[PDB]
Amino acid sequence: VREPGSQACLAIDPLVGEEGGAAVAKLEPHLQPRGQPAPQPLHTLVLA
Amino acid sequence: TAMEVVKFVNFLLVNGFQTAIDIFEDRIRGIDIIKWMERYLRDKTVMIIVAI
Numbered sequence A: 001v002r003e004p005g006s007q008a009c010l011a012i013d014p015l016v017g018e019e020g021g022a023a024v025a026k027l028e029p030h031l032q033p034r035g036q037p038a039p040q041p042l043h044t045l046v047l048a
Numbered sequence B: 001t002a003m004e005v006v007k008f009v010n011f012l013l014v015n016g017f018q019t020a021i022d023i024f025e026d027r028i029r030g031i032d033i034i035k036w037m038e039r040y041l042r043d044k045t046v047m048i049i050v051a052i
Helices: B002-014 B026-031 B033-042
Strands: none
Touching: B026 B033
């Protein structure tokens, strides 16, 4: 008989870098609000 | 959509996009309607918005 002492099997486990991983970022455009005095289209009429 | 398209064009212009639409480019469009349309159809860089 032989003993597995020296030849024992190996388990594996990755060295995950999640602890130092950057996050996913969401973008939102800062709308030029119409609540603030934004301009409007100058629909014109004629006084005949 | 003519009513809502005006609001949409306001939204785009206020946010800095040069929107070409018939009701606003009336003067240039009047010179030659088909040429006016072709100017934007041929140009590959112009984004076209389809109001369904």
